[PDB]
Amino acid sequence: SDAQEILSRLNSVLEAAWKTILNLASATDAAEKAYKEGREEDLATYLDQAASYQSQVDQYAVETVRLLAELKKVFPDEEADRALQIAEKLLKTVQEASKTLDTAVAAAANGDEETFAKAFNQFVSLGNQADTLFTQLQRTLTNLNKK
């Protein structure tokens, strides 16, 4: 059916997103280490890398919202309705993480440790919020792949 193609694309998107999230986590940890070690050029590179993966996560979140809305049209189900609401909250949260990472990038560029520390801490907290949303989404998708 159409529903099966959409679910297959969703599965591929969430698989790719999970890899990107791992890359984002690695870059973020490397930025934390460079920050603690006072290696400003390393920190700049790793913030740029984190931002790149963050932008990709943002795009996977967009694509997930789009695909779930498509699924609701061709295969109505309160579970797909549920996944879409989670996916939309995830999209809001990753965008908020991007904004805070951008603040951290600008603060590092300006050499403004006080703004940097607040922004970087908020980024980490938003990442955790989003990871919690991502896991709910994965389990809703599993409950959808078995219907």
| Partner interacting with residue 16 (select from its own copies, ligand IQM, none; CB below 5-8 Å by kind) | none
Token pair 């959808």 is at which residue?
A: 144
Give the range of 6-14, 33-41, 67-75, 127-135 binding ligand IQM by CB under 6 A.
127-135
Answer yes or no whether residue 28 interacts with ligand IQM by CB under 6 A: yes
Answer yes or no whether residue 77 interacts with ligand IQM by CB under 6 A: no
Helix, strand or coil, per DSSP, at residue 68: helix
d(CA 121, CA 15): 27
d(CA 75, CA 23): 33
d(CA 24, CA 22): 5
Phi, psi (deg, nearest 5) at residue 94: -65, -35
Q: Considering the complex, state which of residue 59 and residue 129 has its C-beta at the smaller distance from its own copies.
A: 59
Residues found near its own copies in the complex (CB under 8 A): 19, 22-23, 25-27, 29-30, 33, 42, 44-46, 48-49, 51-52, 55, 58-59, 62, 65-66, 69, 88, 91-92, 95, 98-99, 102-103, 105-106, 109-111
Q: How far is the CB of 99 from its own copies (least distance, A)?
A: 5
Structure tokens at 52: 């790149």
In angstroms and rounded to an integer, the radius of gyration of the C-alpha atoms of the chain is 17
- Residues with their C more than 2.5 Å from the N of the next written residue in the chain, i.e. before a break, are none
What is the total count of residues that contact ligand IQM (CB under 6 A)?
15
Applying CB under 6 A, which residues contact ligand IQM?
21, 24-25, 28-29, 54, 57, 94, 97, 124, 127-128, 130-131, 134
